[PDB]
Amino acid sequence: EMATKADYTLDEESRARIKTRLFTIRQEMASRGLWDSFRQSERGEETIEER
Amino acid sequence: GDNTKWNENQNPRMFLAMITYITRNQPEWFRNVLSIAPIMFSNKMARLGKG
Amino acid sequence: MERIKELRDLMSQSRTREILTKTTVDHMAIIKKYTSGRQEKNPALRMKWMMAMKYPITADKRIMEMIPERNEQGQTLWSKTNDAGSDRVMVSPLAVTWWNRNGPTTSTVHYPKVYKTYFEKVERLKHGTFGPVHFRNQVKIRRRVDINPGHADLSAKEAQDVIMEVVFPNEVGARILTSESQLTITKEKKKELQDCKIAPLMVAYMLERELVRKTRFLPVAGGTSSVYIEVLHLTQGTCWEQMYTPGGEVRNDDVDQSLIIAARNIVRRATVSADPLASLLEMCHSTQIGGVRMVDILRQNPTEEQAVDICKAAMGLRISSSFSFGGFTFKRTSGSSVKREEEVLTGNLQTLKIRVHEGYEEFTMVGRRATAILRKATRRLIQLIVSGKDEQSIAEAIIVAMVFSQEDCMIKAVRGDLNFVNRANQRLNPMHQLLRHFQKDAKVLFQNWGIEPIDNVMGMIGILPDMTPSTEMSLRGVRVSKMERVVVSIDRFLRVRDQRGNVLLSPEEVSETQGTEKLTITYSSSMMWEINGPESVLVNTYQWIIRNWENVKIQWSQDPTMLYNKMEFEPFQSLVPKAARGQYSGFVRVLFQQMRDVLGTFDTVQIIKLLPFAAAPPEQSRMQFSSLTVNVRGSGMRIVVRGNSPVFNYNKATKRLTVLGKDAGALMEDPDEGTAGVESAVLRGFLILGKENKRYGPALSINELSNLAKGEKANVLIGQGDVVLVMKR
RNA sequence: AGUAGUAACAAGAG
RNA sequence: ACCUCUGAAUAAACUAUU
RNA sequence: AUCUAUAAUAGUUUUUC
């Protein structure tokens, strides 16, 4: 985790809930092999490809 | 000067050729979206009218 | 609360719920224009047909309670039949004219505020002053003029964004007002419209009428400002001019522009006179700018311009030997220049002619946010020392200095579709186009300008192409730093010298551009066209020759010297190129002398065409001329010595002389006209005898006639695709 | 009949 | 037959006005 | 000095045997 001036707006319980949801989504995506492709495509994300 | 039957002698295929030459070295999507109109115009049908 | 209750009501009904759910905001416009089809094809015929109906007019259903069904005479005013596709009812025009005499009355006190522009037109017409009507040879020119001035330093999109910010603060989207003009106008209108009790849409339309500029191409004579364009139908005609001054308050920038135009015209015309100073004075005292005498404006106008300063100096006023270039006030501390037109190839492969100033010179640049010292040579920047305020001010100063330097690097830095002609194919100022192009994006210009190491002198900083304050290397010849009228004497030839004795201004320094005035320029003298545009000057000069053809012909026959010295030809001579004035004068005078000594070869049209070119001091050379050039809006327009021309075409069928497409009058045939096809005023030393004569070999060119000798007849390709026999006297 | 002119009107629909 | 309804919107560019 | 706002309406221009 990171934040501006290390300022975490919410309490650590909700932040930990967010962390565990992200960990669960990563586990589910790794259970199908999609995680590597997901990780590699982040750089080419905010560039609309007209088709 | 006037031209005799300009629109009855010009061909949509030649307009497709002109658009193809004009859009050289352009992205494929742009060439396709410009080329659709001459293609549809070279396969056009005409309503006969009231009768 | 009412809005949300109405929305809840619409969501309860099945069809309205379907519309509200299935229609996106983008498709709201489509369903808003959705209609069953308004079968309107000939609205004039349809209106004439409907006005014969009983109830051709629709009205809201409240009319059944606000207006009685019948009037005193029992005529029906409305019916309960509903209009198609609506709940509006059908009513008679009698209902409208009954409302206008019996309806409830409200307070119409805010109407002058809401419609301030139209009542402003009313006030301008009410307090306007009408002068005399002058019947003249009008020469209108199609130009872009403004019909709605809007705001000065705004565009249509910027004005729209300002309006959205002022009226609809929460609907502006992602726009942020960046220009200081936008912020100032936004604050001003927010304060002015604070606690306003008008509908926001009406306020937005008011601000659109007040702030949105609108320009159009119109055939215009006189001033091109909005106050003169709105009455262009009244003030200008095909054969007449109506002197008129709007009654409102005149913008000062229009006064400055019109003063610059008038001063340039007056100085250029005066340069060709025998005594330029007296001519300039008598022209400045006879000139009015928007109903105001020119001398008063000169006494109360702080405009930095060469011709304006020459006019001021001629009247004993103190001048500031300065000028404007790209939003900065330049002043030449030391150096001299001579203008020279040089053709250059642009970065985007465009060929154009640029007025290049030779010589070494030094300048000081002053702007509202930056200041600089500039030294330069011919198309080469020696050094620039900027001391601006912020990054953008210094960037703008550097860009302006780079464009001013006329560096070939700057020319080659042009990219994209940069046009150097108008949308109507009118030539633009190349320097202005380069400024506007590089003030949009100057990354390529800075990249191609170069770099140079700095020696750390006085702590003045360096600058990098991406606008950073380096201390090791900087832009080539660019350094960064940190943060008056004079009595003059003017010579007989308009040469302005300081008290010490150094030259400050000269007629050659006056710009050759032929612009147009924002405010109508009235000139009162024998020739009301003496300081008019080149087209009017040419047409009126030839019309003056036509009208005065009797005594002009007599003088040409008897005393040509006084004829050549008429003051009427001087506005014409201001159009002939300076280097060619003497050559043209000498050539035409030799032609005239040969025309006198060869009796019967008296071509009236030839004399009329060539006479204005003989008004210059003659220079004797053996060069032949097939055409003589005249500067008209920057392009040398040729007058062909033999036969018709784009400038000068004479029609033998109508006997009517047309100049630049404007009728100049009808000539009358002289008894001494040569009805024998013999010409003596076409070749300087050769007399045309007749048509093609194959006996004398092949045809040659006019530029190769020196080898011929006395009596050697020959065939020459003189004129547009014609071969004739000429002989040497 | 007339309007009109390369096809219509000389009322149409329910 | 009464009765009832109805009196008819090509494309593109431009110009004018708002 | 530059200068195609957006939109709506009307008007104008744009033919073979």
Ligand SMILES: *O[C@H]1[C@@H](O)[C@H](n2cnc3c(N)ncnc32)O[C@@H]1COP(=O)(O)OP(=O)(O)OP(=O)(O)OC[C@H]1O[C@@H](n2c[n+](C)c3c(=O)[nH]c(N)nc32)[C@H](O)[C@@H]1O
């Ligand atoms: O609208 C036109 C004009 O009326 C307006 N203008 C002129 N002066 C003012 C002031 N003072 N206030 C407000 N508005 C003003 O600007 C428009 C000018 O249009 P145009 O006449 O076509 O341009 P001009 O011919 O003036 O040339 P321009 O590019 O603007 O340059 C102006 C001035 O700069 C001189 N100059 C340029 N260069 C590169 C020079 C140089 O190297 N050495 C010297 N000595 N002078 C140089 C130009 O020759 C002009 O004198």
Ligand SMILES: [Mg+2]
């Ligand atoms: Mg034609």
